[PDB]
């Protein structure tokens, strides 16, 4: 067991941060900004590794593809771009959807990337097939806000949608395995998987102020977490600690106990609205990072 002991590792002021991600083996965080800029920071030495003026439009989605030394970003010009973060070379640059890109997910073992879009679809791209579009998942009836592979079975993934559903799909299958009606009448902003095999759980966040935990075997709602006072931008399970982290346009991060679902901490990090979240994939120092209107902060949770 490990006690909560929150330490501010690194904080950096900037334009609004829309996407944020951890590098799995370097002490780096990637941020994608509403200004069209993206930055990689070493949060342990507090040194900027690289910055790129990618576009003039907001860059909403960004992920490391560490095993190719890439970052992949999606922006409101409808385009996916890939950059080598060691050289700055632009690897590819294509219009992926005819509308905004909301979310990007990277398959852990196969050369697949998912993009969720306001065009009501999720699309699957294969970078070992010249970034071919291998599948478009159709069936949602509003903007697809968030996509996430099941870490315990990456042949499936979940899409959260403003049509108030989460759909779980299988690669190569045109119809979803199942559709969760969330009861979150304002729609689903975010979806995330519980990482460990002891619970088949998922978590959703909504503008209706609720965070809901779902059992994807029983398709039932396990718990509803209330406490935020404005739109909940995200909610995720921590990969190694028994906690949930959420962030809201009310300016706060909340840390919840993942067994009792009681709020343990409410943090005003002082950067106004909270928009995005990342956790270190292997729990290194239990790092988390969140992007806000006015920058991002990296915290060690214990």
Author numbering: 0 to 301
Sentences from the paper on this structure:
We hypothesized that if the interaction site is comparable between the αWD40 and β‘WD40 domains, then a disruptive substitution at a juxtaposed critical WD40 residue should yield a similar weakening of S tail interaction with either domain. Therefore, we expressed and purified an alanine substitution mutant of β‘WD40 Lys17, which is juxtaposed with αWD40 Lys15. This β‘WD40 mutant demonstrated a lack of binding to the clientized Thr1273Glu S tail heptapeptide, which is consistent with the loss of binding displayed by the αWD40 Lys15Ala mutant. Next, we determined a 2 Å resolution crystal structure of this domain. This showed a rotation of the Arg15 side-chain reminiscent of the conformational change reported above in the αWD40 Lys15Ala mutant.
